[PDB]
Ligand binder design. Structure first.
Ligand SMILES: O=C(O)c1cc(Br)ccc1N[C@@H]1CCCNC1
Ligand SMILES: O=C(O)c1cc(Br)ccc1N[C@@H]1CCCNC1
Lengths: 157, 156
């Protein structure tokens, strides 16, 4: 129904969505300002690593700093095939996408990195309170020339 | 408008199927394949090989739940959160999962992971289920050495 509360919810959902879209389409130099889409105490980072522990960057300044490292390590990164999922929580979105670009990590040769990604975005007062990325670390190993372990699955149909 | 009332109906029905899927345990896992369409696809989208292990069709889903009940004999999903989307036929689930892993040729272990699941529906049944996790936790549960990525310059 058309109550003012459901209008507020819809309003917020619409503003939050535009922030998700902006985050996902940010490229090149503007990547250095993306930290401004987060709350002061916002957290962003990679939730699927080889260690099994999240790489979580806490706070806007730290996100700012890490965006510099990221521009060096992924100089031409683009997100593609982007699909945004709104949820029953107007402050929570998921995104399913791909990504591609050069990977330049010290200690390895320069490679082409492609992966499939899920992102979680949680909001608070119109800014990102928590962003989390989920991907398959095995595709990153390949991109870096690191040997991928294989599971035998004997007697799988 | 009854378009939105059909949609809301579709969403609430599909959501109960997602709940049932997620809370199925023990022997009832032999019958979960019945929640799928006949042509339905289920499986693991994050593998070491980079290709999905997709199990196509209701009958095959059934047979692969037999294998799965030997490999993961006491598996349970926990800390379940269901996300509805703007599409009444598309849901996401964030959860944990754990239990014994018992694969041929590897030492028995205890597997635990963090999981995302995508469920897409058709006529109130599951047309496509996809699981996404971190394969490195599965390696670890199997005694398989996990390489370490060096991230130099990484700040704090
Ligand atoms: O793209 C950015 O500006 C960026 C900023 C921060 Br801060 C952390 C990582 C970033 N990019 C990586 C590229 C490879 C896939 N994961 C995300
Ligand atoms: O739990 C089931 O009944 C099941 C049925 C099918 Br057919 C395939 C895999 C199954 N379970 C595993 C548990 C370990 C984490 N990924 C999914």
């Amino acid at each position: 129904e058309n109550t003012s509360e459901n209008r507020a919810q819809v309003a917020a959902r619409q503003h939050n969505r535009k922030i998700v879209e902006q985050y996902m389409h940010t490229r090149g130099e503007a990547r250095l300002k993306r930290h401004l889409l987060f709350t002061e105490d916002g957290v962003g980072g990679l939730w699927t690593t080889d260690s099994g522990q999240p790489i979580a960057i806490r706070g806007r300044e730290k996100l700012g700093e890490h965006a510099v490292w990221s521009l060096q390590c992924f100089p031409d990164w683009v997100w593609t095939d982007i699909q945004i999922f709104e949820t029953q929580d107007p402050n929570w979105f998921w995104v399913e996408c791909r990504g591609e670009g050069a990977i330049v990590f010290p200690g390895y040769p320069r490679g082409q990195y492609r992966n499939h990604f899920l992102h979680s975005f949680r909001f608070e007062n119109g800014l990102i309170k928590e962003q989390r990325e989920f991907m398959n670390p095995c595709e990153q190993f390949r991109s870096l020339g690191i040997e991928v372990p294989e599971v035998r699955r004997d007697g799988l149909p």
